[PDB]
Amino acid sequence: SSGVRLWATRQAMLGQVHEVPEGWLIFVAEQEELYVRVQNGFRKVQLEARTSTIEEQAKTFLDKFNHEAEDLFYQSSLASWNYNTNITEENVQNMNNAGDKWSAFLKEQSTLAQMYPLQEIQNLTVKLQLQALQQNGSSVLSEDKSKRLNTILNTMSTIYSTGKVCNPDNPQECLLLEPGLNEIMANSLDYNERLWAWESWRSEVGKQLRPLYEEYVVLKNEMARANHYEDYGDYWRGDYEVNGVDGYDYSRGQLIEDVEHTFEEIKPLYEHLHAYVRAKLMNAYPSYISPIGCLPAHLLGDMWGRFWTNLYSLTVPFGQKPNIDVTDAMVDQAWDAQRIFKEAEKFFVSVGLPNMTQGFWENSMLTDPGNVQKAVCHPTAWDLGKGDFRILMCTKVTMDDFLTAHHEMGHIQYDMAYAAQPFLLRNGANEGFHEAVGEIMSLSAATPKHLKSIGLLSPDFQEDNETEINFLLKQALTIVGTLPFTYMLEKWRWMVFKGEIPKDQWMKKWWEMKREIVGVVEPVPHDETYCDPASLFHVSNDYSFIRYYTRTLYQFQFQEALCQAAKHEGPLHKCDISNSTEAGQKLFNMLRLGKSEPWTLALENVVGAKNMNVRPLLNYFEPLFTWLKDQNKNSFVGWSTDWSPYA
Amino acid sequence: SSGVRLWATRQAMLGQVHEVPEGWLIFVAEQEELYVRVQNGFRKVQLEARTSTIEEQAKTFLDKFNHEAEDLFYQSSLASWNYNTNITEENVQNMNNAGDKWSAFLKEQSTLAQMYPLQEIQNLTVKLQLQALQQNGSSVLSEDKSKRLNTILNTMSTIYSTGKVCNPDNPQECLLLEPGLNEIMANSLDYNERLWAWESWRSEVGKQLRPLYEEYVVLKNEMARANHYEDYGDYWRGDYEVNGVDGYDYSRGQLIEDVEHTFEEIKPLYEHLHAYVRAKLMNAYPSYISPIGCLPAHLLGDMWGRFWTNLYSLTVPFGQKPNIDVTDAMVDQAWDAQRIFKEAEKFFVSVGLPNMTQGFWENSMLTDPGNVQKAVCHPTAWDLGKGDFRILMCTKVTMDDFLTAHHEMGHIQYDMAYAAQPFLLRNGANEGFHEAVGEIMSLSAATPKHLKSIGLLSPDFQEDNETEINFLLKQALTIVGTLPFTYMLEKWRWMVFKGEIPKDQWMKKWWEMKREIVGVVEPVPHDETYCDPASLFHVSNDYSFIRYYTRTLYQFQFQEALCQAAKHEGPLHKCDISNSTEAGQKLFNMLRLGKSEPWTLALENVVGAKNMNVRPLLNYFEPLFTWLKDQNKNSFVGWSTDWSPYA
Amino acid sequence: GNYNYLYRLFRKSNLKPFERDISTEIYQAGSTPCNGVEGFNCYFPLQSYGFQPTNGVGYQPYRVVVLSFELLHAPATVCGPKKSTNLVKNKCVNFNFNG
């Protein structure tokens, strides 16, 4: 013993001096002060002034790769932005060529990185970067298995994107999922029209995708075994996995544990929320919604019941008190996309974050990019590299565009935060961190205190409890509404990749937890021909939906840390972090690392805990929970799986 | 590789450097010097210039307690001292009121100290001080149990004090134990007179204290059992218990066997001593002590048979030969108690111990201040605190009081010696150290060498073996004689606390142990109605009687070590530590430590033996041991338990 | 005991040279706030002195005066006695009249 016992600050040393054993060096990492642990305290130690292995070759190989990678990635990034801004055939070709150049280049380095054995490589950053490169992808399988898996992904993504259903009343009248079916599942309130749209989408897509999905899963599973995973779920569980880090290693199975462990705390709030929606639905559809039965899968505000936000019309806590809107004030104050972005930039400056790049304005587009060029209006950030930061969207004078602008800007702030890190580390620690950071900025941007501070919300405006309940429930519909849907679906892919559910029970098991975990009942029964669990975008397009679940746990914890940092006074849903420079600095310390460090370390450095939890959400919706329990003390609370609209 | 080991002191590492492997850095916590262990020596590495937790709160909690504890204890000691030296109603009020507030102060800080656990404390001193504070004692039980236990002790204290037995000849003529009954069996040699007083007290006290003793023992055990002890004997055995110290841990059960083992090897010396007393008692009581039977209880020169000092008149080795006493020379030089205490002060400066403050002398009652105010003449020490010291003794100009002055001042020097220790640690290592220090110096003072040096004894005094045996036997009767009685009484009390001796067999086993361990048999058959063991002041008032046996073992070890350090030659009873400055410095090494260190470490450093032993006892009385065998060859050696004066 | 005297055995920081601290704030040991009152990890820095004639010599009240002899750009003010010798006359002497 009597070795190196080093920590960050002297305050840690004062609290841990009794912990440090006799003879152990007390080195303060931040203060660069060295002390020796002696009898009842520490003594000052004299310090002087600050001054071919394969691992050395790997460092040369890795850095050399970066310079090539930076250039080629920029070409692919630019080709994408040009194609995204203007969808033309020429824009496609360069995107293909740059992507083909980029993809081919990466595998050569991937194979070359695999030539380096990581066991003899001890640098934490270097070893992580190499394995981040040594990943061979689908090439770990055979080419034909890679060919099948990729082509199916091309087809499955195409089928979901091109999934179009036709009503039996008119064969020629066919409506896509968007905007045809989704508007019907959200805006239309007809029992049959929503039932048909829900049924037809899962019929013409699920039946076609089910054979493709069956082969897709095993292809994804066998590569996971080829990549040393129990299933492709564990392959996606390796994304949050932390290995080799003392005090921060995160096992893949722990991801399943934490998601289920945190989900059980959401059930009581959700159950009363589920009962209240059932209580409100039975006020609108008493026949279609039983007081004890589950909520029909076609009356949930969207195709799959993913979000209950569109049910706010039928489940409004207080019709006389609408949600706080300052979009008209923006119209009154003549605010527009550049103004909103400038206000967002000012808000980011308000929390101490640096002002965003001016080159963004020259390069990125905010409003609708006309019609000659073809572009997507969805909020999309663009960290093209080499200091090139952009956001591609059509921003109008609306809160949603205002909030998503904050959501997208936070990504860019995160993008430049880890831009100092190498290209391999130039990304978020996990898939949900950047999105979670984007959300909390929008949430703070949506705070009425911020709106009142900036003048969007008038000073004489009052935030009554009914409005807060209206706000919280709308938050619950958006956030807590999708949590059970996210929890089961990701867990569904977990067991499907693990093969727990046999082919002849994928649909039956889906409806088993639909009515039980989520309390959602299919209006008409579906069999294994249907592939409704894969009918969503992420499952069809092979995206781990856990990102939404993880970020929601992260964002509330981060916001809770923000509220603690900003010293919020009031309801947690009213927590505004405006004019809180220190919180941005603390957030910057997390964001500056990006993915250079384990996400558990970053999570603890912000919220104080190395594990995600839903404790802020319970605090966030605590007044709402009491109101929901008060509203549900009369109506039945829970859900009966046996009941169904078809029986 | 290599390791670094730190030393508190440079000299400890210098003597522990050869076994250190080469390459280990040599660092000392005091000199802060850098050395590297190299081949056959060490190279001095050049060094540059010098550049919450419960335990820290625990350290601060103790220090604040020490300030108020030192103040209130000083007032309590002062108030009690006034009552002793001046026995008046108001002085009694001061002694009671100050003690009550001190008692109230002790429990309040003890309760507050309970919120400072001992396990997380790294400092043994900090943990030990709180452990003394956190000792709930009788309060671990319910409040009624403590009150009734004190009620028994109050009744035990009053009854023992007021125990008066009336002579059958005159019912009005009644005598208390002190000084009436004690003088009967110490001065009067009439067997019947001693027998009546011995039986009357044990009958009167026994019939009223036996039922109280049964309950008092149970109450003492129950709190000990709740205080994690097997019995109240183990509760008292925790005084010598050592825990948490490497190389010096002492267990409570180790105390039992050490006292037993030490006494067993004393028996061959004691059996000859018992035989000679038995042989000499026949010369005065031919029909009352058998040549093989055990000694009569009241024929031992004292009340309980504890001290055989008065038997020296009847069992003198050579009555014609004089005894070591310069009491006449004390008054031939026109001295007094003040000069006697001055000689006691001269004794400490002769052995090298520093002189004490004059404040002690001006506050100490060395002689009774007349008769208008009553001064308690019971020898005691007063470590009042804040450097205040007093001696409660009506010392006169006599050799007997000359040793008493040395004995009491020995406690005072010891009490001030560990003043550097905290108030909780301002005490002796155990209950047999301060008495040991004062006894050995008095014995050294009583030697002819000390008396001749200061002119108390003429140099023409004949230091022949005739006076050597007479002095040894008188010391043996006082010191060696009380060891068998002290050992059994604590052993008997231990089994009563442990419940081993049946309640209907306490009296028989007490005398059976007296018959066997001590070779002393009661003159009248006492049943369990009697409470002869509790007739002692210590047993009734709940005083651990093992302190005297340990003190006797410690003092001889202390004395022999001083004589060995002073290069004493010849019989050990003539050893004088006067004019030996090294002996006091050697003695003072433990005296400053006090009770912070284990007593085993204290005993080993002073003497050389970690545990107790009887080797100094054999060295002190070796001429007597051979002399006893010469006188005891004509009579039985040992004792016979069956014989009794009543049968 | 002369309890009028108080002494600061614990201070938040070591005093600067010639610096006086007379703060009566409740000294805090751990992280538990005191809020102006004692209790857990909270004590009184200005402990009261208990001084009695019977106290030990090292514990007795000793009066101490520290004489800081500042000499700076400010003109000197505190000089010594400047002992003067006797007067002479009609004799060649080395006279030093005030310099």
Residue A371: count of CB within 10 angstroms of its CB: 7
Residue type, position A72, single letter:
L
Residue type, position B154, single letter:
N
Which of A343, A345, A408, A463 is flagged as catalytic? A408
The helix (run of H) or strand (run of E) holding residue B8 is: none
Residue A333: count of CB within 10 angstroms of its CB: 15
Q: How far is A22 from chain B (nearest CA, A)?
A: 8
**Which of C10, C41, C54, C57 to probe by mutation at the B interface, max B CB count within 10 Å?**
C54
Label the pairing between strands A25-28 and A4-7: parallel
- Listed in sequence order, the residues at least 6 apart from C36 whose beta carbon sits closer than 8 Å to its beta carbon are C25, C26
What the block records as the tokens of A336 is 């527009």
Contacts of range B604-610, beta carbons closer than 8 Å, 24 or more positions apart? B604/B248, B606/B557, B606/B558, B606/B561, B607/B557, B607/B558, B607/B560, B607/B561, B608/B561, B609/B557, B610/B248
What the block records as the tokens of B559 is 């004395």
Spatial contact of A492 and A510, defined as CB atoms under 8 Å apart:
yes
| CA distances, B243 to each of B120, B128, B250, B360, B597 (Å) | 15, 10, 7, 36, 11
DSSP class per residue in chain C: --TT-EEES--SSPPPTT------PPEE-SSS--TTS-BTTEE-SEEEP---TTS-GGGS-----------SSSPP-------------SS-----S--
Phi, psi of B461 (to 5 degrees): -60, 135
Alpha carbon distance A542, A540 (integer Å): 6
Q: How many residues does chain C have?
A: 99
Alpha carbon distance A337, A379 (integer Å): 12
Q: Is B5 on the interface with A (CB under 8 A)?
A: yes
Alpha carbon distance A233, B284 (integer Å): 105
| CB half-sphere exposure, A143, CA atoms < 13 A | 0
SS3 label, residue A19: coil
Spatial contact of A283 and A515, defined as CB atoms under 8 Å apart:
no
- Listed in sequence order, the residues at least 6 apart from B589 whose beta carbon sits closer than 8 Å to its beta carbon are B605, B606
| CA distances, B627 to each of B470, B631, B633 (Å) | 11, 7, 10
Residue with tokens 């079916």: A181
Q: Is B52 on the interface with A (CB under 8 A)?
A: yes
List the subunits that have 3+ CB pairs under 8 angstroms with B.
Answer: A, C
Measured between beta carbons, the chain B residues lying within 8 angstroms of C53 are 359
Label the pairing between strands A164-166 and A174-176: antiparallel
Contacts of range B486-490, beta carbons closer than 8 Å, 24 or more positions apart? B486/B306, B486/B545, B486/B546, B486/B548, B486/B549, B486/B552, B487/B259, B487/B260, B487/B263, B487/B517, B487/B549, B488/B513, B488/B514, B488/B517, B488/B518, B489/B533, B489/B536, B489/B539, B489/B545, B490/B259, B490/B544, B490/B545, B490/B546, B490/B549
Alpha carbon distance B114, A318 (integer Å): 55
Method used for this model? cryo-EM
**Which of B384, B388, B423 to probe by mutation at the C interface, max C CB count within 10 Å?**
B388
Alpha carbon distance B481, C74 (integer Å): 83
Measured between beta carbons, the chain B residues lying within 8 angstroms of A45 are 51
User: What is the DSSP-derived secondary structure letter of residue A644?
Assistant: -
* Greatest Cα pair distance in chain A: 89
Number of H helices, E strands in chain A: 25, 10
**Would the annotation count A592 as a binding residue?**
no
Alpha carbon distance A12, B642 (integer Å): 74
**Burial classification of residue B386, based on how many CB atoms lie within 10 Å of its CB (0-12 exposed, 13-18 middle, 19 or more buried):** buried
Residue type, position B111, single letter:
T
Alpha carbon distance A242, A418 (integer Å): 19
- Listed in sequence order, the residues at least 6 apart from A483 whose beta carbon sits closer than 8 Å to its beta carbon are A263, A266, A270, A549, A552
Binding-site positions of B for chloride: 202, 510, 514
- Contact check, Cβ <8 Å, B60/C10: yes
Alpha carbon distance B521, B640 (integer Å): 9
Alpha carbon distance A530, A200 (integer Å): 10
Residue type, position A548, single letter:
Y
Nearest CA among A89, A202, A108, A163 for reference residue A523: A202
Q: Is A9 on the interface with B (CB under 8 A)?
A: no
List the subunits that have 3+ CB pairs under 8 angstroms with A.
Answer: B
**Alpha helices, DSSP H only, in B514-545?**
537-540
SS3 label, residue A28: strand
The helix (run of H) or strand (run of E) holding residue A646 is: none
Binding-site positions of B for substrate: 306, 378-379, 548
Please report the beta strands in A289-379, taking only residues with DSSP state E, as ranges in sequence order: 295-296
Measured in whole angstroms, the distance separating CA B63 from the mean position of its chain's CA atoms is 30
- Listed in sequence order, the residues at least 6 apart from B107 whose beta carbon sits closer than 8 Å to its beta carbon are B139
What the block records as the tokens of B162 is 């007021």
- Listed in sequence order, the residues at least 6 apart from A151 whose beta carbon sits closer than 8 Å to its beta carbon are none
Phi, psi of B242 (to 5 degrees): -125, 130
Measured between beta carbons, the chain A residues lying within 8 angstroms of B124 are none
Spatial contact of B74 and C59, defined as CB atoms under 8 Å apart:
no
Spatial contact of B166 and B137, defined as CB atoms under 8 Å apart:
no
What the block records as the tokens of B493 is 């009390």
List the subunits that have 3+ CB pairs under 8 angstroms with C.
Answer: B
Alpha carbon distance A115, A107 (integer Å): 12
Label the pairing between strands B295-296 and B380-383: unpaired
Tell me the torsion sign for CA atoms B397, B401, B406, B409. Answer: negative
Residue A334: count of CB within 10 angstroms of its CB: 8
Q: A6-25: buried (b, 16+ CB within 10 Å) or exposed (e) per residue?
A: ebeeeebbebebbebeebbb
- Listed in sequence order, the residues at least 6 apart from A474 whose beta carbon sits closer than 8 Å to its beta carbon are A309, A312, A323
The resolution of the experimental structure, rounded to one decimal in Å, is: 3.4
Spatial contact of B406 and B347, defined as CB atoms under 8 Å apart:
yes
Measured between beta carbons, the chain B residues lying within 8 angstroms of C57 are 357, 359, 387
Residue A271 is among the residues annotated as catalytic for this protein: no
What angle do the packed helices A483-498 and A506-516 form, to 10 degrees? 150
DSSP class per residue in B363-425: H-B-S--TTTS----S-EEEE-SSS-EEEE----SSHHHHHHHHHHHHHHHHHHHTTTS-TTT
Alpha carbon distance B166, B204 (integer Å): 10
Q: How many residues does chain A have?
A: 647
What the block records as the tokens of A19 is 């912990």
What the block records as the tokens of A65 is 């790769």
Residue B105 β-bridge partners: none
Residue A538 is among the residues annotated as catalytic for this protein: yes
